[PDB]
Design a protein around this nucleic acid. Structure first.
Lengths: 320, 238, 320
DNA sequence: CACGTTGATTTTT
DNA sequence: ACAACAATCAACGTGA
């Protein structure tokens, strides 16, 4: 598989965006109790239940772009530090720090996910993404769990007085699916392996990741195109309607019905498409990228080349 | 010559830092023309450099022929987007944060030690336009135009479904006189042979729009209850 | 084993993640009627019964997030007090109040399991844990027991009137098994011995420790890794499918079935695996670690070194 | 840019 | 019978 796809990608990172998009179609499946919160509640919005002309509105959980992109992004930076392509030490010549002045201008993270220092340089994110939505309703997709924090002596009382340390917290359930399209513009082949790496290699999202929030990123198709294909909301509303609301289905029926709904949508969207990797060609492509991420020699080679390409972009067209 | 009635539906929440007051940053309820013009035509017509460095990294290139990210390329392509009227809208106020990438985090006061430079340290609240919203714009062009059925806008590059119809020559008509525009309209794009008699304004970066105006000049009655200014082009007042 | 494992760990705690996960694969077997509750009933969730074959929905018990980290955490703290590295008296320079201001910010609990109250910042848990699931359905895995409370006079009346102090509570049956992966990031070798010590040395879990809730943790594997392996739910759904739902098998056969599914799943993870301690190498290593925790000199030395490591992390990168 | 410094509000049958 | 949390998230001035 990967040996055939090497034709599609750019040979080196371009200055101007050229309109080659590789789109990853995924179902992110909740595995243990994620908490996609801001403002003290699970983020929700009213939406129409499905594309077939409903009167019927539906409150669905929203995983914002930040809440999914940053856990992918940071799981790339720790891989680059483990390969020794970047460093955490302030005295190293290849230091990179995530947000401040100390952000690199060369490393793969900085070129694919972007940076903004100010006049000393900025770079646009090549990884495009959207806010993901629960396939079902909030009322079906959450439960509220009490927590307490007693004295170590096992008691809510100490010295005869009670601690105020009790509250509820709101959690998403262990089967909730978030249909997602992640999209990568104008990437080199190794840029596609780094980003697809993040999608498969990162596994925790949202708050309290030390204790909760595992998700399984099931990739459902890869689609090469001249442009943007569809939104997460539009895929979710199509997928709800293909099921007619019988949301209580096993993971593999939910992934195979997403593979045919994706192809039903791609046929209507007006962008030309070079490749549509689905089914047994996706399962061989996934095996061939798993084989890179398990091999020390192969991965240090590819990510070494990515480094070089991004260090060359930096010095030729980038922030120098 | 051609006119396209384009209605924009938000498929995720849109943020622009239009005004800021303490912890709160908020989005104006009208999408500015120049923002939508790059959302439609950047990469297809206007160049899209992935990187910036220098003075070019914090100075706009809106109407500067010397730079690549001009809106003037579109004057030469014979195209003009108008700003966006909100048909149906809602706001969500959602917090955003800086990540603690290190295992240890200190809450640092903004402007304190180790925090002495303008960056998004700590937290803020964004008043975003929500998924429950619909906006209406018009594009006017002198050539049949392959408009993208998806665009991205704002601080977080948020998806909009564009569903578009060309307004056919059987239902538009051309006229001249005094007319109430009733769509938004950017005063910087106003030519000679239009004059603005009355306006009501929406104060907004990079420049204020009119939300309602009475004009004297040429127009197209594009349906029996709206009148669109004819001959507008990017930066025509300069 | 310990003489070779020493090379995999970092020589001191870093401020940023440098890859270097160690994953503790366990089965937690119930031994004496655990109660795992929030909101007054045993915690349960609907799940697909197994990954590929047995694709029907099933309710399984949830050993929710902190119910499998607070036992560990507190058992390590009473060892730090026993070794005299920390104290519980006010007006001692090595006090560590649990979940308050007056947390030490230097001891191994404060660094490995984290803190967030008061001035002097907050610290992320280097032990990453997740909610565990019952391998069997709720219906085969629980019972409700009446409890009453008479007057000491041996009857439910003190003046002819009734006490009526009668209620039900639900308890998880013995031999109910909870597959789980505990994960440790960026440890020193002494930090691994501390966390692994907590996992082998803790034995009570649920509500009502004083009367109930003993469990038997069988460590089935230890996997050194470049990143996160599978969720608890995924190991559970794989183990149910491998048994065909025939869950009335002895614990030796169940621990040997968990070992082969964990190795099948690990060969499908985009993770470089530096070491994969299983079976006869693991029951070597478990003995070499029991030999630490049964020796007063060896443990004092090791855990004292850890105290220095964690106090130096505190002065160099942490709370100063 | 890099040193240093330390006061304020009024209340949800 | 009895707790529903707990903290942290500048605003200048002065000299070089």
């Amino acid at each position: 598989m990967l040996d055939s796809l090497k034709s599609q990608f750019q040979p080196s990172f371009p200055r101007l965006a050229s309109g080659h998009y590789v789109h990853f179609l995924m179902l992110r499946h909740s595995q243990s109790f994620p908490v996609f919160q801001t403002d003290g509640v699970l983020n929700t919005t009213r939406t129409q239940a499905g594309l077939l002309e409903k009167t019927d509105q539906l409150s669905r959980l929203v995983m914002f772009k930040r809440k999914q992109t940053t856990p992918e992004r940071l799981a790339g930076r720790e891989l680059l530090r483990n390969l020794g392509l970047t460093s955490a030490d302030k005295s190293a010549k290849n230091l990179c720090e995530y947000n401040g002045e100390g952000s690199c201008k060369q490393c793969p993270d900085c070129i694919l996910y972007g940076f903004a220092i100010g006049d000393s340089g900025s770079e646009r994110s090549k990884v495009y993404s959207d806010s993901a939505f629960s396939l079902g309703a909030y009322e079906q997709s959450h439960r509220s769990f009490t927590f307490n924090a007693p004295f170590e002596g096992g008691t809510m009382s100490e010295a005869g007085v009670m601690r105020s340390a009790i509250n509820e917290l709101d959690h998403i359930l262990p089967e909730v699916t978030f249909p997602t399209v992640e999209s990568l513009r104008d990437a080199t082949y190794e840029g596609f392996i780094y980003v697809l790496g993040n999608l498969l290699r990162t596994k925790r999202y949202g708050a309290q990741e030390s204790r909760t929030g595992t998700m399984k990123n099931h990739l459902v198709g890869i689609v090469f195109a001249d442009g943007e294909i569809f939104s997460n909301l539009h895929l979710t509303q199509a997928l709800y309607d293909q099921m007619g609301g019988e949301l209580n289905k096993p993971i593999s029926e939910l992934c195979e019905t997403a593979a045919t709904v994706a192809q039903d949508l791609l046929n209507k969207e007006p962008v030309r498409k070079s490749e549509l990797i689905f089914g047994a060609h996706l399962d061989t492509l996934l095996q061939e990228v798993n084989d890179i991420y398990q091999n020390d020699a192969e991965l240090t080679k590819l990510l070494g080349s990515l480094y070089q390409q991004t260090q060359d972009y930096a010095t030729e067209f980038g922030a120098l | 010559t051609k006119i396209y009635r384009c209605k924009l539906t938000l498929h995720d929440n849109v943020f622009f830092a239009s005004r800021e007051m303490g912890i709160l940053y908020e989005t104006e309820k009208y999408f500015h023309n120049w923002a939508l013009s790059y959302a439609f035509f950047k990469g297809t017509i206007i160049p899209h450099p992935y990187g910036l460095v220098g003075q070019n990294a914090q100075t706009p290139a809106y109407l500067d022929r010397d730079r690549e990210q001009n809106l003037l390329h579109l004057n030469d392509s014979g195209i003009y987007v108008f700003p966006a009227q909100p048909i149906h809208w809602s706001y969500q106020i959602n917090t955003f944060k800086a990540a603690q990438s290190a295992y240890y985090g200190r809450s640092v006061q903004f402007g304190g030690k180790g925090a002495t430079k303008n960056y998004p340290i700590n937290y803020g609240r964004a008043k975003e336009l929500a998924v429950g919203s619909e906006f209406l714009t018009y594009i006017v062009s002198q050539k049949e135009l392959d408009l993208p059925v998806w665009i991205r806008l704002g601080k977080w590059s948020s998806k909009i479904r564009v569903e578009v119809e060309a307004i056919a020559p059987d239902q538009i008509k051309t006229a001249s006189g005094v007319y109430v525009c009733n769509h938004p309209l950017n005063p910087l794009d106003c030519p000679a042979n239009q004059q603005i008699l009355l306006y009501n304004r929406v104060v907004m970066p990079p420049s204020s729009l009119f939300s309602q105006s009475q004009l004297q000049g040429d127009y197209w009655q594009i349906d029996r209850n709206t009148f669109l200014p004819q001959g507008f082009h990017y930066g025509a007042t300069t």
